[PDB]
Symmetry: D2
Subunit: 262 residues, 4 copies
């Protein structure tokens, strides 16, 4: 396979049962890693995800957990160490979103998105870094951000805030723990072909509208994001820390400015 | 009288009893505005500040409120509209911070900083914009950020995350409500001479270290930031929205590279 | 009279005979400054502008010069010091642009834009700072940039590159000369109502397309930018150096994401 | 090997005889690519570089050329196509630098650095894109930038300007040619162990000073940058365009802020 240093590394992935999380689980499985698949409630998809990792060449366990509960995040990292003996790569991928005019967004709805997308990632990063620090492991954290840590997002002010926060969180942790050889990075996906979007992307006018925001002209395949994760996790990225690697087909480059407009 | 257009405008300021909030309160008093001074803890300080605003030529009330409580933020804007008749400028300035190695940061401590620094500003921004939209007012929001929406801050990952989040919140709201003429900006102070830093700056070793990180060579004066706030609230900045204006003596320009090191 | 501290300050402005440079010339006249109007091509325009500055309450000369010629830039600053006694504010505003598919852009055409937009501002900045350093003056430099130091611009790769370069030049000079109290900032205009755009904005289809890319919904007025320049040159912005202040009606916030598309 | 899609791809590298250029040449040779090594005057190092690529498993030619001469850049890309049949990846790596107080920097010295570091890269990118466009190849451009497209650099205002320009150049070309499947990216190296630095890094106090600017605590090995180039060139980065991938051991994260300072 591609990244031989990933062989037998322990990789924890929150929200790893579907979409980008699942595609990363499979990709690490192709690198013969040991994958720990976290999931919220859908056991059967998690079980499905588990079998793919094994069929791709990896070992895999599944572990239920809500990333807004501190005990569940703590339990997740502990289960990883118990079952597989160590922890090498931590991937905070869980996320939720919903459209609301910002002046109408409730505090409860704001909190759900902040608690899930930002705080969940802090909790995961923290538990992983604690472990690397205590055991002198030169481990790796990948936080799943979005083009919306840079691109503002009307109707999604909670989501945008959560990812803008994630960017400074990641950059801080990278600076703080760089002297220990612990690397911390964001991946910034653009529009991706995942379950959350299956409804929207079946509709031809909506699919075309979205593709018109993508300079490369196509909706990303989850494996293209998983390719970025494998690179970032591997020793090929040994000197790469504190960055956001956008995988967005050019979306952060301002799609409205194609053909020299404005 | 510099910004004549500010005369009789209603300006609400959270944490307006001390430091930067106080300086802003005074300055808008100097512009003959109607300043609403929110405070959490210390009525005696708020009273002392209410006096300065009045002496400087402004009108002022004080309103107790905790920015982490929705009812208190809603109450604050409603009080402003009761007492002064309307709302023109909403300044979300309240903030807290404390150093903790990130892998040792507790969830409650992380939540306290996020709730105060980011969510409080969301609540502030939401209530003001709600009022602007329902009443066809071309209102203005100033969110008080930090060099640390750009500069990562080891030991302060909660703070850094809250301001990185504030950046994207501001940018989103500016984009979302620009067609209504409602403008939303951040100010980014560097190291400022305020109570929050009084401990640090007393120690001449610590004061010198902080100063060695400011290219302009001096710790900022709170009036230098209030000058930026008066500009942004004024019609002078009519085409200016969604920005962060750093008032930092050069701090975001990378202190370590002075004289060309590296 | 807004910024009383600007009275009798010597302000040099390249391309000060038309558009934004003219608006800045007028505005500093309104602050009772001594405006030096550089121009390349059209004395009759420069004369018409010299008049406005004088009517608005300022003192003004005109000086012919090509900003791509070192001798002309050196001459310009030397003329300013001859005629008015000193130099306080140096504004590098001259710029050119033309659309060409990048793979068809000639080296001479690329050079013309770089030489004019970036190198001319370097020469301007260098000569002013040289004068500030030798004479212990806490001078000020405003470099006129664009949304396109951040927004990429197909068909205008030369322009975009010149302003991206201007950004780092400004930031470097701000860092390098901050300990001397010399401040250096950029302004970043979006789509502005100037001669350079008169062709584009005459066509009602083209005017509407440009407007659909401004969140605030209108093409900027040149006085809105001159208001930003007066602020930055003034002592109100005493702690502000090394920044880019965008005056763009929200354009850097990603036009394509209005109403929450994507 | 690692990236099997790189097998037999034609890769042109300017300044490919030494340092980062040489390390990329060798790394592509390890991927069994066909490497075209450009060089300014040192034929013997270029010859040395050539033999390494072959010994690593690649094909390789050397071609003399000065990137400030348009004909030399044109000849380089033509020689690549002539000799190897096509062009797949273009790498603009040539660069020069020297320290000068900015107010003392000559126009000739400014131009040399601009012409080499920025214009050379425009010329290379242009000739490559022309070829990809004319022949419907989904090719790849990698422009060698620096941490100094983001980190300002006193005494190196020409270098900083050149790389700030390179950033907007790359981003523009990525947006412009994304619909054609042509990807364009920057790599941003921090302090790297290359010949230009051998003098500085032999001295223990200077080596320690530099390492103190690096959060990861070590000077980068050229192969760590070449690892980024291989990733970016490969189809693993299929959805990655218009980005700068910093490989700097955390240098852009503000080294002066370690341990919670300021
Ligand atoms: N002083 C500095 O060097 C810098 C401060 N700025 C920011 O500017 C703002 C102003 O702070 P300073 O005046 O410097 O310090 P400060 O501590 O004097 O002011 C902060 C204010 O926030 C208030 N506050 C805290 N929690 C609150 C709550 N739950 N509800 C209502 N009010 C609450 C405090 O009562 C206080 O008056 C802060 O957001 C700070 O983060 C950021 C960058 C640097
Ligand atoms: N108008 C707009 O929408 C925007 C313009 N700004 C920038 O603001 C600046 C002002 O331009 P505008 O007033 O809008 O257009 P303009 O074309 O009216 O002004 C540009 C000025 O530069 C001068 N100039 C050109 N080459 C010169 C040379 N070699 N030597 C001396 N002067 C020379 C011209 O004579 C002209 O007066 C420009 O740098 C432009 O790039 C940037 C963003 C948007």
């Amino acid at each position: 396979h591609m990244y031989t240093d990933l062989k037998d590394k322990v990789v924890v992935i929150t929200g790893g049962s579907t979409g980008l999380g699942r595609a990363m689980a499979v990709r690490f499985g192709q690198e013969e890693a040991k994958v720990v698949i976290n999931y919220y409630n859908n056991e059967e998809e998690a079980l499905d995800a588990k079998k793919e990792v094994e069929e791709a060449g990896g070992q895999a366990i599944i572990v239920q957990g809500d990333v807004t509960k501190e005990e569940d995040v703590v339990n997740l990292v502990q289960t990883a160490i118990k079952e597989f003996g160590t922890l090498d790569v931590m991937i905070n991928n869980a996320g939720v979103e919903n459209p609301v005019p910002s002046h109408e967004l409730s505090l409860d709805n704001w909190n759900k998105v902040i608690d899930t997308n930002l705080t969940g990632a802090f909790l995961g990063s923290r538990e992983a870094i604690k472990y690397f620090v205590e055991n002198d492991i030169k481990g790796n954290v990948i936080n799943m951000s979005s083009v919306h840590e840079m691109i503002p997002w009307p109707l999604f002010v909670h989501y945008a805030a959560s990812k803008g926060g994630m960017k400074l969180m990641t950059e801080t942790l990278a600076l703080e723990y760089a002297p220990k050889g612990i690397r911390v990075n964001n991946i910034g996906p653009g529009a991706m072909n995942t379950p959350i979007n299956a409804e929207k992307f079946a509709d031809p006018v909506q699919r075309a509208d979205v593709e018109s925001m993508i300079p490369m002209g196509y909706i990303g395949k989850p494996e293209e994001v998983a390719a970025v994760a494998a690179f970032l996790a591997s020793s090929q990225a040994s000197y790469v820390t504190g960055i956001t690697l956008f995988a967005d087909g050019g979306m952060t480059k301002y799609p409205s400015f194609q053909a020299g407009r404005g």
